[PDB]
RNA sequence: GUAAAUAUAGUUUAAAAACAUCAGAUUGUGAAUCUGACAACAGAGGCUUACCCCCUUAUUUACCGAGAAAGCCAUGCAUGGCUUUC
């Protein structure tokens, strides 16, 4: 039933240690993805990749780094309205699918099928997929394109005087397409004579090789030997997802050489250097102009030495890398991302009042007095993402890190892809930074606020290998539901809880009662590790099992984080005269009814609590896409107001400086200011229409 | 070989023209491949079809007029108006002469209105033909008006494609059109303060027509959308920009917010003659909006 | 930003006509014409005779995370609160 048209392969993820190993294929009939991994939702959204018709999702290995992001993709598909979706992998995924339910949310009108390894074939007559198991467990997939022999030779039908312009000729097409020989124009014409040499379909293999224990078995594969040498269906290309060390193995090199020049040997690994978000780099570079350390340059991956020149070609993978297969097989590297910081700088410079505002701020700061009291740089606070929902290009799911001391760091809102921002923000020092972590805090029970919890832990082990320190089960505080579903994942899909230690949030509540002596020992160790004096948890009235946290150190500085909540007196009592407050800010004023319905406060409520808190400074967080790029500004806001952005660095000494940055911010958002003006006009029109 | 494969696709049954000229084949060859040539061939075929249909209709009407003329001859009633006529029937000539006098008066004392022909690099051949046709319609609408503008054709390169097409289309009338055509820009002819550059992407919204302001319309037809081109050009010279009020007065419904040159000039002429915004915006195509906001 | 629809380059209804546009005609009162110019249903890409789709912009509309099972407390077999399981 028909034949496939032009088909394209794409490298969604460059293969870096942060959000790597993501492959994509698209044709007119349908499209597919391999190794969704983690954080690929934002990457696809930024690059305008179509998510519709992504019926099938594939993978190579059970590691969370290959399957962590399924939740976001399935939720996006559910929002779109696609009714069906299927997965391919080991049977244990079924249990893993069940796991997602515990934090899936309302899932309806969507089918979650599975394609175990035992399945013989998939077919669909568009593209065929082969399942190949591996053992020391990994699965690789060989995909063969469908046959498209349908063709007709030029001008020889006219020489034969075929009865064109009629209907009875249409069936005859099949006679020549199927392979029938007929007598026409006094010639016993064969079908092959009037048919272009059929092409059964290009083939390509996707495989991940963790180490030599998986290098050895692959060669002793009958399926691979079938396509090695004089393959029945010659392989157009092969994509390898393995590190450089695996890529240089003698057995691996020989296996690669087996195919010969026919293949192209595209590769993907950590060594690849590229940018996964042009917008993020552009905005952070532009912000770096205003002040260096508040907006530090985002270190970009840059491999020191290119991989060794192996005998076979090694096509290093890159983000947005494109390869057309039909009707031509070539590297269509036309829309590959490029790094041009100077272009971004000049584009920002060519804005109204931006450079002038920056110069005025420079003059004010230079003339301003030096910080009194010589406040110590530590502790530091870095906001990785401030998004409140499915992450967008501008922002990211809420996530913050507080460095109490160069050897003590705490994490709040370990959302989806947090490790990605950690990598993008701390380059190679990520190892030291991860080793610095003492514990991770969990906000109100919700998938967005704990999506990325597993990946971090795994990476920590790797960091521990780099430092060589003894195993240290990382501490985390959260309700028992987190423990339950993490245990299910541990005992079903991938064993991770042995690397973690859990603490109920209730036991940390004000006036709480110790549940067990082990809990007391764990909390005492937590307090000792970060040199903290008091860690307080309080209930918040936005949903069941929700906690807001407060940190009080020996130096006396009190920092209070709330997350999803509404103005609560208990919060004020807990954080009375707090040094700093970071509070959610989802919607704008005048929308109190929907704010109550969604159980999220607005700006006016933020100022009301802040003045109620009596805290020295207040910071806004947890924003929505409606505030695409700019937060609300008004002189009515106190100087204590603080607006967060991706990878925003702040310290105590910066408290008297945040308001001074208000102008330049709005200076950079001129187009976004116009967008806000249009949005306000639309809101006014809607409100007046509703009132009348 | 070339016309051979063209005849091959003819045999394929594709809609193609007949007895095509050499320039048309050159233009077809200029196309890249496949769809471009197919669209051009379908165009030319439809053009020939319309031409032949008009020829048939014209011949039918000629024969009908001949037979009806003999029938009207059969009456011979005579006594037609008693031959009491005050004027000869030379009305088209008189209308042309009156329009010429009005155009001279406008060239001497009329309000300037500029079409800047600085987009030849942003337009394909088809868009260039469309721009020329709309320029003719706009100029014609200006001539008939009770108070014509003084039309300037600024940035019009002498040997450029647009000037060549305008000359070809106007013939000897080109040298007699009562308008100022010059290679210089609108900024070299008028003070920068009096120039308002009309664009659909300007932040500012036009409120009232000003009689001491020189309005600049971009003689640009982009069926391939290129937003901000006219705004970008106006920004290099640092000229004030205004946009027609279409969200304020019309419920836009479905359509494109950039009007044609003829519609723009008709709106501006209605405004210049003390017309209101409803009357002026009656020239917006009805298919786009749904009504005038009350 | 994401899904839907829609896109007539002079206008409208249709699926090609009518009204319009430019040049020439010193027109005997139907010039209510004659001779010409223009004629592209948003922009780009195939593919089987014909069978449609894929993509990019533009306009309008609506916009992202808790099912059941068992044990207890209160209300009038049903409801609210909590605890363990997936
Ligand atoms: N809504 C509107 N407001 C103001 N000028 C408009 C307009 N619609 C059309 N125009 C005028 O008509 C011209 C042809 S429309 C071409 C628009 C093109 N995007 C551009 O860059 O201009 C425009 O250049 C502008 O001069
Ligand atoms: Zn949140």
Q: Collapsing DSSP states into helix, strand and coil, what is residue A180?
A: coil
Distance in Å, CA A508 to ligand 2 centroid:
21
Distance in Å, CA A156 to ligand 2 centroid:
69
Q: Can you point out the beta strands (E) in A108-230?
A: 111-116, 127-134, 138-145, 182-184, 187-189, 203-208
Who's near B264: CB < 8 A, 6+ residues apart?
Answer: B138, B198, B217, B244
Q: Are A583 and A610 in contact (CB under 8 A)?
A: yes
Which residue, among B139, B149, B218, B211, has the nearest Cα to B185 in the 3D structure? Answer: B218
- The whole-angstrom distance between residue A671's C-alpha and the CA centroid of its chain comes to 27
Q: Are A25 and A4 in contact (CB under 8 A)?
A: no
Could you give the CA distance from residue A134 to residue A213 in angstroms, rounded to a whole number?
Answer: 10
Could you give the CA distance from residue A354 to residue A348 in angstroms, rounded to a whole number?
Answer: 8
For B204-228, give one letter per residue: b (16+ CB within 10 A) or e: eebeebeeebbbbbbbbbbeeeeee
The DSSP element (H or E) to which A526 belongs, if any, is helix A517-529
Question: What kind of experiment solved this structure?
Answer: cryo-EM
List chain C nucleotides near protein: any atom < 7 Å from a Cβ. Answer: 1-13, 16-18, 21-29, 31, 33-35, 37-51, 53-60, 63-67, 82, 84-86
Q: Collapsing DSSP states into helix, strand and coil, what is residue A278?
A: helix
Could you give the CA distance from residue B194 to residue B215 in angstroms, rounded to a whole number?
Answer: 8
Who's near A691: CB < 8 A, 6+ residues apart?
Answer: none
Could you give the CA distance from residue A494 to residue A66 in angstroms, rounded to a whole number?
Answer: 12
Which residue, among A87, A78, A100, A97, has the nearest Cα to A59 in the 3D structure? Answer: A87
Residue nearest to atom 1 of ligand 1 (CA): B200
Q: Compute the CA torsion angle A163, A166, A172, A177 (nearest 10 deg).
A: 100
Q: How many CB atoms lie within 10 A of CB A96?
A: 21
Nearest to B13 among A155, A165, A674 (CB): A165
Q: Is A165 on the interface with B (CB under 8 A)?
A: yes
Q: How many CB atoms lie within 10 A of CB A592?
A: 13
The DSSP element (H or E) to which A686 belongs, if any, is helix A670-691
Distance from CA of A164 to the nearest CA of B (A): 9
Q: Is B1 on the interface with A (CB under 8 A)?
A: no
Q: Which residues of A touch B13 (CB under 8 A)?
A: 164-165
- How many Å apart are B221 CA and C9 C1'? 7
Who's near B127: CB < 8 A, 6+ residues apart?
Answer: B221, B222, B223, B224
Which of B4, B10, B11 is the mutation pick for testing A, counting most A CBs within 10 A?
B11
Discontinuities after residues in chain A (C–N over 2.5 A): 136
The DSSP element (H or E) to which B196 belongs, if any, is strand B195-198
For residue B217 and ligand 1, the question of a CB distance below 6 A is answered with: yes
Burial label, A425 (beta-carbon count in 10 A; 0-12, 13-18, 19+): buried
- How many Å apart are A151 CA and C47 C1'? 10
Tokens of B147: 């108070």
- Three-class SS string for A232-260? CCCEEEEEEECCHHHHCCHHHHHHHHHHC
Q: Is B33 on the interface with A (CB under 8 A)?
A: no
A413: left (phi over 0), alpha (psi -120 to 50) or beta: left
Q: Is B13 on the interface with A (CB under 8 A)?
A: yes
The phi, psi pair for B71, rounded to 5°, reads: -60, -45
Q: Check B8 against A154: CB less than 8 A apart.
A: yes
> Long-range contacts made by residues A491-498, C-beta under 8 angstroms, separation at least 24?
A492/A92, A492/A95, A492/A96, A492/A98, A492/A99, A493/A62, A493/A92, A493/A93, A493/A95, A493/A96, A493/A99, A494/A62, A494/A63, A494/A64, A494/A454, A496/A64, A496/A454, A496/A457, A496/A458, A498/A473
Q: Compute the CA torsion angle A181, A187, A192, A197 (nearest 10 deg).
A: -160
In which residue are the tokens 């009592």 written?
Answer: A573
Helix locations, chain B, DSSP H: 2-11, 22-30, 35-75, 91-109, 125-144, 161-170, 186-189, 229-237, 261-272, 277-281
Distance from CA of A184 to the nearest CA of B (A): 19
Resolution in A, one decimal? Answer: 2.8
For A528-560, give one letter per residue: b (16+ CB within 10 A) or e: ebbebeebbbbbbebeeebbbbbbbbeeebbbb
Find the angle CA(A477)-CA(A481)-CA(A483) to the nearest 5 degrees: 60
Could you give the CA distance from residue B240 to residue B214 in angstroms, rounded to a whole number?
Answer: 11
- The whole-angstrom distance between residue B222's C-alpha and the CA centroid of its chain comes to 14
Q: Check A158 against B203: CB less than 8 A apart.
A: no
Q: Which residues of A touch B8 (CB under 8 A)?
A: 154-155, 158
Nearest to A674 among B8, B13, B203 (CB): B203
Residue nearest to atom 23 of ligand 1 (CA): B218
Tokens of A514: 């110790």
For A305-317, give one letter per residue: b (16+ CB within 10 A) or e: eeeeeeebebbbb
User: Strands A56-58 and A84-89, how do they pair?
Assistant: parallel
The phi, psi pair for B80, rounded to 5°, reads: -90, 105
What residues form DSSP beta bridges with A553?
A532
What residues form DSSP beta bridges with B262?
none
Tokens of B93: 């000539």
Q: Is B205 on the interface with A (CB under 8 A)?
A: no
Q: Check B8 against A155: CB less than 8 A apart.
A: yes
Q: How many CB atoms lie within 10 A of CB B92?
A: 8
Which residue, among A546, A559, A549, has the nearest Cα to A510 in the 3D structure? Answer: A549
Q: Are B263 and B280 in contact (CB under 8 A)?
A: no
Q: Ligand 2 is a single-atom ion; what residues have CB below 5 A from it? A: A 388, 398, 622
Distance from CA of A600 to the nearest CA of B (A): 34
In which residue are the tokens 């060989």 written?
Answer: A142
Could you give the CA distance from residue A274 to residue A301 in angstroms, rounded to a whole number?
Answer: 7
Tokens of B51: 């031409």
Burial label, A17 (beta-carbon count in 10 A; 0-12, 13-18, 19+): middle
Tokens of A667: 């200076």
What residues form DSSP beta bridges with A380?
A403, A651
Ligand nearest to the CA of A444: 2
Q: Is B32 on the interface with A (CB under 8 A)?
A: no
Q: Can you point out the beta strands (E) in A212-344?
A: 235-241, 266-268, 315-316, 322-326, 330-331
Burial label, A332 (beta-carbon count in 10 A; 0-12, 13-18, 19+): middle
Q: Is B60 on the interface with A (CB under 8 A)?
A: no
Distance in Å, CA A21 to ligand 1 centroid:
47
Q: How many CB atoms lie within 10 A of CB A427?
A: 13
The phi, psi pair for A472, rounded to 5°, reads: -135, 100
Could you give the CA distance from residue A539 to residue B162 in angstroms, rounded to a whole number?
Answer: 73
Tokens of A32: 């597919």
Could you give the CA distance from residue A574 to residue B126 in angstroms, rounded to a whole number?
Answer: 72
Ligand nearest to the CA of A540: 2
Could you give the CA distance from residue A561 to residue A609 in angstroms, rounded to a whole number?
Answer: 12
Q: Omega before A327 cis (within 30°)?
A: yes
Who's near A564: CB < 8 A, 6+ residues apart?
Answer: A443, A444, A446, A540, A542, A543, A546, A584, A599, A600, A622
Could you give the CA distance from residue A49 to residue A202 in angstroms, rounded to a whole number?
Answer: 24
Which residue, among A530, A525, A482, has the nearest Cα to A502 in the 3D structure? Answer: A482
Distance from CA of B15 to the nearest CA of A (A): 14
Burial label, A521 (beta-carbon count in 10 A; 0-12, 13-18, 19+): exposed
Tokens of A446: 């919700």
Which residue, among A231, A206, A271, has the nearest Cα to A23 in the 3D structure? Answer: A206
- How many Å apart are B89 CA and C33 C1'? 12
Distance in Å, CA A550 to ligand 1 centroid:
57
Which residue, among A94, A91, A86, A88, has the nearest Cα to A111 in the 3D structure? Answer: A86
Q: Are A193 and A215 in contact (CB under 8 A)?
A: no
What residues form DSSP beta bridges with B196?
B215, B240
Q: Which residues of B touch A155 (CB under 8 A)?
A: 8
The DSSP element (H or E) to which A484 belongs, if any, is helix A480-492
Distance in Å, CA A586 to ligand 2 centroid:
9
Burial label, A167 (beta-carbon count in 10 A; 0-12, 13-18, 19+): exposed
């Amino acid at each position: 039933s028909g034949g496939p048209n032009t088909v394209y392969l794409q490298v969604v993820a460059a293969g870096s240690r942060d959000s790597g190993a993501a492959l994509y294929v698209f044709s007119e009939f349908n499209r597919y993805l391999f190794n969704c991994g983690e954080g690929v939702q934002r990457l696809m959204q930024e690059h305008k990749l179509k998510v519709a018709r992504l019926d099938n999702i594939f993978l190579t290995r059970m590691h969370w780094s290959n399957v962590g992001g399924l939740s976001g993709m399935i939720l996006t598909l559910k929002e779109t309205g696609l009714p069906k979706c299927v997965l391919s992998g080991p049977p244990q995924l079924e249990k893993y699918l069940e796991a997602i339910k515990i934090f899936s949310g309302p899932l309806k009108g969507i089918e979650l099928a599975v394609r175990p390894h035992s399945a013989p074939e998939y077919e669909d007559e568009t593209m065929t997929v082969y399942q190949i198991p591996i053992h020391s467990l990994v699965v690789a997939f060989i995909c063969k394109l469908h046959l498209k022999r349908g063709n007709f030779l030029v001008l020889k039908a006219k020489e034969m005087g075929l009865p064109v312009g009629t209907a009875a000729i249409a069936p005859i097409i099949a006679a020549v397409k199927d392979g029938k020989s007929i007598t026409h124009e006094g010639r016993e014409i064969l079908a092959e004579e009037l048919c272009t040499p059929p092409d059964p379909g290009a083939a390509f293999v996707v495989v991940e090789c963790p180490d030599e224990s998986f290098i050895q078995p692959i060669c002793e594969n009958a399926t691979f030997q079938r396509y090695q040498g004089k393959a029945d269906a010659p392989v157009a290309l092969v994509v390898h997802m393995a590190p450089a060390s695996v890529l240089v193995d003698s057995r691996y090199q020989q296996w690669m050489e087996r195919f010969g020049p026919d293949t192209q040997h595209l590769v993907l690994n950590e060594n690849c250097a590229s940018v996964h978000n042009l917008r993020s780099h552009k905005i952070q570079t532009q912000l770096n102009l205003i002040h260096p350390d508040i907006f530090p340059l985002l270190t970009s991956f840059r491999c020191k030495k290119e991989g060794p020149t192996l005998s076979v070609p090694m096509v290093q993978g890159e983000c947005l890398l494109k390869y057309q297969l039909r009707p031509r097989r070539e590297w269509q590297r036309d829309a590959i991302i490029t790094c041009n910081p100077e272009e971004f700088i000049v584009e920002a410079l060519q804005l109204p009042n931006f450079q002038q505002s920056v110069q005025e701020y420079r003059r004010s700061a230079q003339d301003g007095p030096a910080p009194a009291e010589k406040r110590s740089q530590y502790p530091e606070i870095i906001f990785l993402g401030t998004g409140s929902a499915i992450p967008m290009k501008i922002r990211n799911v809420s996530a913050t890190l507080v460095n109490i001391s160069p050897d003590t760091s705490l994490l709040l809102d370990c959302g989806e892809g947090t490790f990605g921002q950690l990598c993008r923000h701390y380059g190679d020092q990520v190892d030291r930074v991860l080793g610095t972590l003492a514990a991770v805090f969990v906000s109100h029970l919700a998938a967005d606020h704990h999506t990325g919890l597993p990946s971090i832990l795994l990476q920590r082990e790797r960091a521990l290998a780099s430092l060589g320190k003894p195993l240290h089960p990382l501490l985390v505080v959260a309700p028992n539901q987190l423990k339950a579903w993490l245990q299910q994942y541990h005992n079903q899909c991938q064993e991770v809880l042995h690397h973690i230690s859990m603490i109920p949030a209730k036991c940390l509540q004000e006036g709480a009662e110790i549940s067990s002596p082990a809990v007391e020992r764990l909390i005492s160790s937590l307090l000792r590790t970060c040199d903290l004096e008091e860690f307080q948890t309080c209930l918040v009235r936005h949903c069941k099992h929700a906690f807001g946290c407060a940190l009080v150190h020996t130096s006396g500085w009190k920092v209070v984080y709330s997350g999803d909540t509404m103005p609560c007196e208990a919060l004020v009592r807990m954080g009375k005269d707090a040094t700093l407050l970071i509070h959610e800010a989802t919607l704008e004023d005048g929308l109190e009814e929907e704010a109550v319905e969604k159980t999220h406060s607005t700006t006016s409520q933020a100022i009301s609590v802040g003045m109620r808190m009596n805290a020295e400074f207040i910071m806004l967080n947890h924003f929505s896409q409606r505030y695409a790029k700019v937060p609300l500004f008004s002189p009515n806001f106190s100087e204590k107001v603080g607006v967060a952005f991706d990878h925003m660095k702040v310290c105590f000494g910066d408290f008297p400086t945040m308001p001074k940055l208000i102008p330049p911010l709005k200076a950079l958002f001129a187009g976004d200011i116009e967008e806000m003006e249009e949005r306000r006009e639309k809101r006014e029109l809607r409100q007046v229409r509703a009132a009348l | 070989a070339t016309r051979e494969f063209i005849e091959m696709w003819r045999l394929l049954g594709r809609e193609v023209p007949e007895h095509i000229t050499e320039e048309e084949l050159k233009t077809l060859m200029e196309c890249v491949s496949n769809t471009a040539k197919k669209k051009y061939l379908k165009y030319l075929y439809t053009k020939e079809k319309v031409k032949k249909a008009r020829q048939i209709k014209k011949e039918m009407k000629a024969a009908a007029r001949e037979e009806a003329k003999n029938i009207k001859l059969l009456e011979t009633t005579e006594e037609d108006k008693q031959k009491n006529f005050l004027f000869l029937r030379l009305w088209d000539r008189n209308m042309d002469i009156a329009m010429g006098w009005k155009g001279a008066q406008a060239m001497q004392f009329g309000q300037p209105l500029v079409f800047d022909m600085a987009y030849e690099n942003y337009m394909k051949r088809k868009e260039l033909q469309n721009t020329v046709s709309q320029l003719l319609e706009s100029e014609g609408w200006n001539r008939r008006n009770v108070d014509p503008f003084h039309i300037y054709f600024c940035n019009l390169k002498i040997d450029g494609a647009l000037h060549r097409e305008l000359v070809k289309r106007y013939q000897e009338k080109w040298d007699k059109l009562l308008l100022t055509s010059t290679e210089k820009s609108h900024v070299d002819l008028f003070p920068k303060d009096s120039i308002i550059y009309l664009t659909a992407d300007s932040p500012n919204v036009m409120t009232t027509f000003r009689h001491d302001k020189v309005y600049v319309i971009g003689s640009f037809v982009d069926k391939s959308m290129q937003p901000g081109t006219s705004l970008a050009k106006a920004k290099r010279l640092n000229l004030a920009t205004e946009c027609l009020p279409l969200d304020k007065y019309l419920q836009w419904e479905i359509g494109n917010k950039n009007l044609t040159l003829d519609q723009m000039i008709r709106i501006l002429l209605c405004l210049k003659n003390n017309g209101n915004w409803q009357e002026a915006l009656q020239f917006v195509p009805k298919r786009k909006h749904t009504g005038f906001l009350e």
